[PDB]
Every structure is written in structure tokens, then in C-alpha cells.
Amino acid sequence: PLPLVVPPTPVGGNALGGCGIITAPGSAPAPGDVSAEAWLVADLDSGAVIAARDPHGRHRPASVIKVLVAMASINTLTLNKSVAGTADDAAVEGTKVGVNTGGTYTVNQLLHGLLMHSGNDAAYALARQLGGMPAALEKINLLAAKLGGRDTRVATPSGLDGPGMSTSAYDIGLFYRYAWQNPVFADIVATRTFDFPGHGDHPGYELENDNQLLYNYPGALGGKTGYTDDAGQTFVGAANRDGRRLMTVLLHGTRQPIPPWEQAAHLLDYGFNTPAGTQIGTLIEPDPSLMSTDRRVDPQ
Ligand SMILES: *C(=O)[C@@H]([C@@H]1NC(C(=O)O)=C(S[C@@H]2CN[C@H](C(=O)N(C)C)C2)[C@@H]1C)[C@@H](C)O
């Protein structure tokens, strides 16, 4: 498939087009124990990009791209709506939360499995519920486009590598800023333990959130991990300290010299350590249609 057009001016501001580390004039040096080849630090409320490295460079997202199938689902599917599991859901590769034949799962439960344990089976199930893989990918990429994600083409809902798969640290920032503005999404990613339904002879179990930033970083709102052979380590994390809500995105990193979540902690530290109002660019606003919602009693 042909590559996506590169915009004539970097989206969010001219400064966001460069390689390497971009910071406001006079600012402190960026953390040196970050191995992410691309990253972003941004304000969730104002949309200000505080600092970045190759923010518009194109890289694979791995599992952090799950934000799009999650929001497509939250937007268009009823939370208590029951979805029947299939063997196809269980047949997907990678991490799974136990979605299978003979199982019934609410969209809500699938979303917790999707986001707390990166359940690829939950992703696949939601994709069928969005109308099967072709329709799901069309909706996911429509959502990406309507959020201004002009670097983003999604090959799979789960983040598994596929032809044409691409995103940027900026775009991922766009997607998670939008997602964190939805209380349903916010609640889920902040959730430490969740009762996941069993099925048939399979019993329910307590699902735990895999995200270490959530446990170890004070003020953390949570986040999302990822890794594939092509993407390397990816990570999104956010925190609220004294009303300042910062987000960091990491792409194409490694687990050296410190784990990805700890690299993220340092970038968040760096972000809080920059003066408020600092801005090298902005996360552009979603299409207006994405920011509002469109919705027995007869005389008898
Ligand atoms: C998403 O990236 C893949 C899956 N989701 C998760 C996850 O979020 O942790 C894993 S990646 C897991 C992270 N730590 C491992 C690692 O760093 N190495 C093996 C080097 C892998 C799943 C694989 C989804 C695309 O399948």
C-alpha cells in the first residue's frame, strides 16, 4: 500500500518536524536514560506539546494502538451489550484474557481485558462487534483521520504488525488525549483489578492491570504498554499532579537502560519540571463530531 501523504507543514506546528530532541529555548536537558527513538510529552488539558523527539517520525505502534478500537467501541457500542466469544478470538496470537466459545462478554468487560492486559482476543472480539475486521479497520482508520492522525494507518486493531501499519508519537498523543477526555476510558485505564467473567466450566478470575507506572508513579492515571519485533518497545502513560495533567508517549524504544515505564516516568518528571505554559507546538483538536454524543413510553 502507498505511504500516507506527509502534510506540507508538520501538524501541530513547524517545530514538530525535526529529528532528535526538541525542547523550548533555555529548558533543562532531556532525560538520558530514554531509549525511545521517538517520544512526546504533552498537556492533556491544554494540548500543549512540551517536548518531543522525532514527534512526526513514522513508526509502528504495537499494542498502544488499541486506544482506537477501544474508543470506536466506547463511542458506537453500548457498554452492557453482550458479545458472544468465538474460537477465532482465542485463535489470535499474543496475550489473551480468555475470550472464547461458550463465553458471553459485555463490551465493558472486553474493554477492561483489552486495556488492562492488552488482550488481543478482546480486540478481535470488539472488531467483529464493530462489523468484522474490514468494517472495524475502516472505522478505526476513520477515527484516526478524524482525530488528525495523518501519520496513522492501522493494519490491525490489536497492534500486531501488518502491511502499511504506521503511526507517530504525535498521533498516539492525539488519540490518547481524546480517549482520556472520555470518563469511561479514563476509569478503565486507572483500574487496578477487575472481575473478568468465566464461561462454562471456565471460572471467572481477577484481572490485574499490567501497567507498572500506575502502581509506582504518584498521581499516575495509568497507561498502555506495547512491543513487537518491528515496533520495539512502545509506551503511553499519564499523571495528574496538582491539576496539571501530563501525558508521555514513547515509540521504538528498548528495555535498556531501564524499563519502558521508568523511561516514561522520567519524561513525565521532565514535563512537570518544565515551566507551566511551555509549548513547542500543540495537539490539534478532534473533529467536532467526535466531541459530543447523539442519542416504552407510548400511551398505553
Ligand atoms: C502489544 O504490544 C502486543 C501484546 N500486548 C502486550 C503488552 O502490552 O505488554 C504484549 S508485549 C510484551 C511486553 N513485554 C514483552 C517484551 O518486552 N519482550 C518479549 C521483549 C512483550 C503482547 C505481545 C500485541 C501486538 O500482541
Numbering used by the authors: 59 to 353, 360 to 364
Sentences from the paper on this structure:
Here, we presented structural and phylogenetic analyses of two meropenem-sensitive Mtb penicillin-binding proteins, Rv2911 and Rv3330. A search of the Mtb genome for Peptidase_S11 Pfam family proteins (PF00768) yielded two hits: Rv2911 and Rv3330. The structures showed similar overall folds containing two subdomains.
Rv3330 was bound to meropenem, a beta-lactam antibiotic that was added prior to crystallization. The Rv2911opt-PMSF structure was determined at 2.0 Å resolution using multiwavelength anomalous dispersion of Se-labeled enzyme. This structure was used as the search model to determine the Rv3330-meropenem structure, also at 2.0 Å resolution. This unique conformation is stabilized by several key interactions. First, the alanine-like moiety within meropenem is hydrogen bonded to Thr283 through the carboxyl and to Ser176 through both the carboxyl and amide groups. This interaction mimics the contacts made by the D-alanine leaving group of the natural pentapeptide substrate. Third, the π-system of the distal carbamoyl moiety participates in a stacking interaction with the phenyl ring of Tyr284. Finally, the oxygen of the carbamoyl group is hydrogen bonded to Asn291 and Arg313, two residues outside of the canonical active site motifs that are nonetheless universally conserved among mycobacterial orthologs of Rv3330. In contrast, the distal end of this inhibitor, which is variable in carbapenems, points away from the stem peptide-binding site. In the Rv3330 crystals, Cys77 residues from adjacent molecules formed a disulfide across a two-fold axis.
